[PDB]
Structure 1
Amino acid sequence: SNISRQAYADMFGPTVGDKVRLADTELWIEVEDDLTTYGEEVKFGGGKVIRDGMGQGQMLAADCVDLVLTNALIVDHWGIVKADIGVKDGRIFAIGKAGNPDIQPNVTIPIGAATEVIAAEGKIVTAGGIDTHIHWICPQQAEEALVSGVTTMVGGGTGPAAGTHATTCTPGPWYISRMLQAADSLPVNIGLLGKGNVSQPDALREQVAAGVIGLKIHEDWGATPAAIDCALTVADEMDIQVALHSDTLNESGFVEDTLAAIGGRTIHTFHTEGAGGGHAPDIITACAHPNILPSSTNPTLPYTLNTIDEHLDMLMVAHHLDPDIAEDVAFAESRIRRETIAAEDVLHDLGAFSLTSSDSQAMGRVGEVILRTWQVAHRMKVQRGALAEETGDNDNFRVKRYIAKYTINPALTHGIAHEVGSIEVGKLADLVVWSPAFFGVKPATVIKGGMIAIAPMGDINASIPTPQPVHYRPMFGALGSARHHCRLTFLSQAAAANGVAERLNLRSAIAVVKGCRTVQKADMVHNSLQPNITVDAQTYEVRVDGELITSEPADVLPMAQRYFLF
């Protein structure tokens, strides 16, 4: 028959041309396409469509999906579309039209007796976030991140030890082995980074052979040209990634010397703006190079009225610096610059910076990677208007550019994009379901490897799952053996071949990293700009092609006081 558009949206979620506001920001997305056949949408419930002989077919388990997310509004780097999502064997099976081919047309995702249903009508579905700057200071960080919508965590550490407080390094075979074993207990995919600060190759090869998927070069362990060259030489031969925190003190040379030491080899530069570490005051100029994959940590995102004030003491504790030692306080101050902090936001909007990350408990907030990425987008739309790439009256392109920063780009940078990072067929089913009013702030459901791992849950004894108090609680996907089956422990190709998984008796699924040496700035989705950027040595002013890059500090931000109790 016929149905009005509003009534339609209320029943099945929005369709082509409808717009949805992201949380309480000024960003609006418009549905670009809808893969359904009007009148044939599948809906579950009392007397609905998904029932025997109707929306559910007679096929065996092998011929139908294990899980279907009905009427989902997908937001990914490749599009903003309405479709059903089929999951089979813990992986994304298809994005299309679900149902029973026996009575329905255009069915690409068959529903059968073996199919579970998650109703996504009116909800936005995204890939799970990937944070590549984790300091394993405490295990509780994994739950915090999972709850925020982050399903993969790459970093290093051994617990609350001075070395880990300051750097993302899991030093040596013994600690690496121990942390790989401990990782089986966490409900997120994990990959470890070893200490790359050494001028003896074999000391690095041992760590890679033990299991790390990358090497962290940190100034606290000596970010010298010799150490940098050594780590990159080993990375080139073992197909692992190098993450850099440069020499802020300019002790061994200036930024141009470090860049020269890198010699055009692939490298991921952490907190490229500089507040979190790096040649003062021009480490930000690294985003101009083709071999540099640049990321920001989150406390400087976005530039607000209280940003500068909180940074000094945060800096000190994170790096074991003494406020009574003049040289210690002078180098802390040389890292905090209003000029580079303001420019960073714009560089993200332009696609010059390609990733966002936390820098958990070492000048960063583990549960705020996604939230802050969207606050930057909002602030940039408000200040700069539409991007040159926008088409139509929506912010679709800006949304695709920013979502890529914490999903596909981090995946490409670290060689794990073949497993996770986006909603594409064959990738692990790490999905996050959001209600539009809480997008980027508080998820409705977090799915790991095809099983729900954490979600808001009301009174356990209640007659329904909705009564208060409603707060995040671990689900079956986070339990014992089911967890092992639904998470991945990433290893280097050498570790995988050496039988590290068998030796340590790792219980989780194993994935191997590859393609870390061949990625370049041009490969970063929607964020491949290489600007002719300069930093004034005296004033710290950032300029691109001579024009001054800057922005204004926010006094109030969305996704803040309206959602949190504290």
Structure 2
Amino acid sequence: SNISRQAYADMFGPTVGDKVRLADTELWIEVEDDLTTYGEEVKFGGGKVIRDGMGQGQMLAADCVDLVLTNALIVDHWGIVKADIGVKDGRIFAIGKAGNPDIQPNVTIPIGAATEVIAAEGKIVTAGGIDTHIHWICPQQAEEALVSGVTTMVGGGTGPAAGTHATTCTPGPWYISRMLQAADSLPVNIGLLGKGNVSQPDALREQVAAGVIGLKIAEDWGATPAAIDCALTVADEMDIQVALHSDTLNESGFVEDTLAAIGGRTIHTFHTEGAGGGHAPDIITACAHPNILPSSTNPTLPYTLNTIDEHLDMLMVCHHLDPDIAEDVAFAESRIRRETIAAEDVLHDLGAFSLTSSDSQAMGRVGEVILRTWQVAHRMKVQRGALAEETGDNDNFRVKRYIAKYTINPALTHGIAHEVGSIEVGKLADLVVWSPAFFGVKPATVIKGGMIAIAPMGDINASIPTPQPVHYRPMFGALGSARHHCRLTFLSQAAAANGVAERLNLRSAIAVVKGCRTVQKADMVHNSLQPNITVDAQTYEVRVDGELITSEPADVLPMAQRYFLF
């Protein structure tokens, strides 16, 4: 028959041409495509469509999906489309039209007796976030991250010890082995980083064979040209990623010397702006190179009124510095520059900075990677308007550019994009369901490997799941063996070959990292700009092609006081 567009949206969610505001920001997305056949949409409930012989068929388990997310508004790097999502075997099966082929047209995602249903009409579905800068200071970080929408956590540490407080390093075979076993208990995909600061290759190879998927070079352990070159040599021969926190003190050389030490080899630069660490005051110039994959940690995102004031003591505590020692305070002060902090926001908007991460409890907030990334998008739209790539009257492109920063780009950088990072067939089903009003802030459902792992849940003794108090509680996907089956522990190709999983008796699914040496800036989805950037040694001003890069500090931000109790 005929149905008005408003009534249609109210039942099935928005369709082609409709726009939706992301939370309380100034960003609007517009449905680019809808893969349904009008009048043939599937809906679940008493007296609805998904019923025997109607929207559900007679096929066996092997011929239908295990889970279907109906009428979902997908937001990913490749598009902002309306479609059904089929999940089978814990992996994304298809993105199309779900239903019963017996009586419905164009059904690509068959629904049978073995199919569970999650109603996504009116919801936004995205892939699970990937934080590649985790300091394993406490196990509690995993739930905090999972609740925010991040399903994969990469980093290192052994718990609340001085070394982990300052650096993302799980030092040696014994601790690597211990952390790998402990990882089975956490509801997120995990990959470990070892301590890469050594001038003896064998000390690195052992760690890689023990299981780490990358090596962290932190200045707290000495980020000298010799250490850097050693780590890169092993990385090159074992197909693992190197994460760098350069020499802020310029003790062994300036930024150009570090860049010389790297010698054009692939490397991931942590907190490229410098506040969290790196050559003073120009580590930010690293983003101009093809072999550098640059990322920001979150406290400096976005530039606000209270950013600076908060930074000094934060830095002191993180790096075990002494305020009664002049050289220690001057070290801290040399890292905090309003000039580079302001430029960082713009560089993200231009695509010069390709990733955003946390730096969990070591100058970063583990549950705010997604939230801050969108705050930067908002502030940049407000200050710079539409990007040269926008088409139509929406922010679809800026949205694709920013979402890639914490999903696919972190996955490509660490060689795990073959398993996670985006909503594409064959990838692990790590999905996050959001209500438009809480997008990027509080998820409606967090799915891990095809099973809901955490979600808001009301009174347990209530007659329905909605009564207060509604707060996040662990679900079946986070329990014992179900969890082991729904999460991945990323190993190095060598550790996999050595039988590390069998020896440590790891219970979770194993994934192997590959393609860490071949990724370059050009491969960063929507963020491959290599600008001719300069930093004035005296004034710290950032310039791209001579023009001054800068922005203004925000006094109020969206996704802030309207959503949190504290």
Task: Report if TM-score (shorter chain) is over 0.5.
Answer: yes
Q: State the match for 2:25 in structure 1.
A: 25
1:61 Cα deviation from its structure 2 partner: 0.1
- How far, CA to CA, are the matches of 1:198 and 1:266 in structure 2? 18
What's the CA shift string for 1:459-478, capped at 9, x where partnerless? 00000000000000000000
1:230 Cα deviation from its structure 2 partner: 0.2
What's the CA shift string for 1:379-430, capped at 9, x where partnerless? 0000000000000000000000000000000000000000000000000000
1:222 Cα deviation from its structure 2 partner: 0.3
- How far, CA to CA, are the matches of 1:102 and 1:271 in structure 2? 54
SS of match in other structure, 1:550 = coil
What's the CA shift string for 1:343-398, capped at 9, x where partnerless? 00000000000000000000000000000000000000000000000000000000
- How far, CA to CA, are the matches of 2:119 and 2:97 in structure 1? 14
1:27 Cα deviation from its structure 2 partner: 0.1
1:313 Cα deviation from its structure 2 partner: 0.2
- How far, CA to CA, are the matches of 2:376 and 2:179 in structure 1? 34
- How far, CA to CA, are the matches of 2:356 and 2:446 in structure 1? 20
1:9 Cα deviation from its structure 2 partner: 0.1
- How far, CA to CA, are the matches of 2:439 and 2:474 in structure 1? 20
- How far, CA to CA, are the matches of 2:53 and 2:13 in structure 1? 25
1:527 Cα deviation from its structure 2 partner: 0.1
What's the CA shift string for 1:120-145, capped at 9, x where partnerless? 00000000000000000000000000
Q: State the match for 1:302 in structure 2.
A: 302
SS of match in other structure, 2:405 = helix
What's the CA shift string for 1:150-206, capped at 9, x where partnerless? 000000000000000000000000000000000000000000000000000000000
SS of match in other structure, 1:305 = coil
1:435 Cα deviation from its structure 2 partner: 0.0
1:34 Cα deviation from its structure 2 partner: 0.1
- How far, CA to CA, are the matches of 1:182 and 1:547 in structure 2? 50
- How far, CA to CA, are the matches of 2:71 and 2:364 in structure 1? 36
- How far, CA to CA, are the matches of 2:13 and 2:394 in structure 1? 18
- How far, CA to CA, are the matches of 2:484 and 2:406 in structure 1? 24
What's the CA shift string for 1:265-313, capped at 9, x where partnerless? 0000000000000000000000000000000000000000000000000
SS of match in other structure, 1:334 = helix
- How far, CA to CA, are the matches of 1:385 and 1:323 in structure 2? 42
SS of match in other structure, 1:184 = helix
- How far, CA to CA, are the matches of 1:305 and 1:198 in structure 2? 40
* Number of equivalent positions: 566
- How far, CA to CA, are the matches of 1:297 and 1:381 in structure 2? 21
What's the CA shift string for 1:417-454, capped at 9, x where partnerless? 00000000000000000000000000000000000000
- How far, CA to CA, are the matches of 2:320 and 2:260 in structure 1? 29
Q: State the match for 2:316 in structure 1.
A: 316
- How far, CA to CA, are the matches of 1:526 and 1:256 in structure 2? 27
- How far, CA to CA, are the matches of 1:319 and 1:62 in structure 2? 54
SS of match in other structure, 2:29 = strand
1:216 Cα deviation from its structure 2 partner: 0.1
What's the CA shift string for 1:246-280, capped at 9, x where partnerless? 00000000000000000000000000000000000
SS of match in other structure, 1:301 = coil
Q: State the match for 2:358 in structure 1.
A: 358
RMSD, aligned CA: 0.1
What TM-score does the superposition give when structure 2 sets the normalisation length? 1.00
Q: State the match for 2:259 in structure 1.
A: 259
1:36 Cα deviation from its structure 2 partner: 0.1
1:13 Cα deviation from its structure 2 partner: 0.0
- How far, CA to CA, are the matches of 1:398 and 1:251 in structure 2? 39
Q: State the match for 2:156 in structure 1.
A: 156
SS of match in other structure, 2:125 = strand
1:500 Cα deviation from its structure 2 partner: 0.1
Q: State the match for 2:83 in structure 1.
A: 83
1:80 Cα deviation from its structure 2 partner: 0.0
Gaps of 5+ in 1: none
1:8 Cα deviation from its structure 2 partner: 0.0
Q: State the match for 1:277 in structure 2.
A: 277
- How far, CA to CA, are the matches of 1:462 and 1:66 in structure 2? 28
- How far, CA to CA, are the matches of 1:322 and 1:425 in structure 2? 52
SS of match in other structure, 2:442 = coil
Gaps of 5+ in 2: none
- How far, CA to CA, are the matches of 1:511 and 1:21 in structure 2? 37
- How far, CA to CA, are the matches of 1:454 and 1:493 in structure 2? 31
SS of match in other structure, 2:348 = helix
- How far, CA to CA, are the matches of 1:362 and 1:196 in structure 2? 18
- How far, CA to CA, are the matches of 1:40 and 1:238 in structure 2? 51
1:535 Cα deviation from its structure 2 partner: 0.1
1:516 Cα deviation from its structure 2 partner: 0.1
- How far, CA to CA, are the matches of 2:368 and 2:53 in structure 1? 46
Q: State the match for 1:224 in structure 2.
A: 224
- How far, CA to CA, are the matches of 2:256 and 2:430 in structure 1? 40
User: After TM superposition, where is structure 1 displaced by more than 4 Å over at least 4 residues in a row?
Assistant: none
- How far, CA to CA, are the matches of 2:24 and 2:100 in structure 1? 38
Q: State the match for 1:523 in structure 2.
A: 523
Q: What is the 5 A alignment of 1:42-191?
A: 42-191=42-191
1:559 partnered with 2:555: no
